[PDB]
Amino acid sequence: MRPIHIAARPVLILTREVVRPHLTNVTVAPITTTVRGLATEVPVDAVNGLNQPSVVSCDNTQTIPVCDLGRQIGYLLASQEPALAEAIGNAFDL
Amino acid sequence: RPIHIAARPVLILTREVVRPHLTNVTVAPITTTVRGLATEVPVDAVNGLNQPSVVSCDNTQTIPVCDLGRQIGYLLASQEPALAEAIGNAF
């Protein structure tokens, strides 16, 4: 998926890309350097677009307006898409 | 270039190049009350408004894009050197 920058934190775009231009909001998942090693965390480093080993926190999923979405700084590798699918799954119980 | 925001008609100072790549924007407000300084850039109905007003460069403000509104007007390139000086004279 498409890690972008938003007010200021790096976020992972959870909202499906298809309907993105047709919505005034977007569901994203913040990224923190504070890694706790949970099932709700998806590890991401500089390969992903960042500049420090961090994690995608699926526990703090937030929906924000598009005018608070900013510069696209990075990519989430397709190989990681199952992991993500699991993290969320574990964050919400399924 | 001039758009609206909050609410006053404002002039987008921030380069348009990075505008879509930013969640904020540096703008300069526009008031009908002209005080007649070197840091003011005159603008009329030609620009897209319908009243003689001035760009106040001393009151430059950076605001989130979520505070940006409909676009009402244009700044002619001929006025754009003056602006370049205004800021220079302001700062």
Curated annotation (Swiss-Prot), chain B:
Domain of life from the UniProt record: Bacteria
EC number: 3.1.-.-
Gene Ontology molecular function: any one: RNA endonuclease activity
UniProt key word Cytoplasm: no
Keywords, alphabetical: Endonuclease, Hydrolase, Nuclease, Toxin-antitoxin system
EC category name: hydrolase
GO biological process, one term: rRNA catabolic process
Parts forming coiled coils: none
Quaternary organization: Forms a complex with cognate antitoxin MazE3.
Family per record: Belongs to the PemK/MazF family.
Chain's role: Toxic component of a type II toxin-antitoxin (TA) system. Acts as an endoribonuclease, cleaving in U-rich regions. Neutralized by cognate antitoxin MazE3.
Name assigned to this protein: Endoribonuclease MazF3
Gene name for this UniProt entry: mazF3
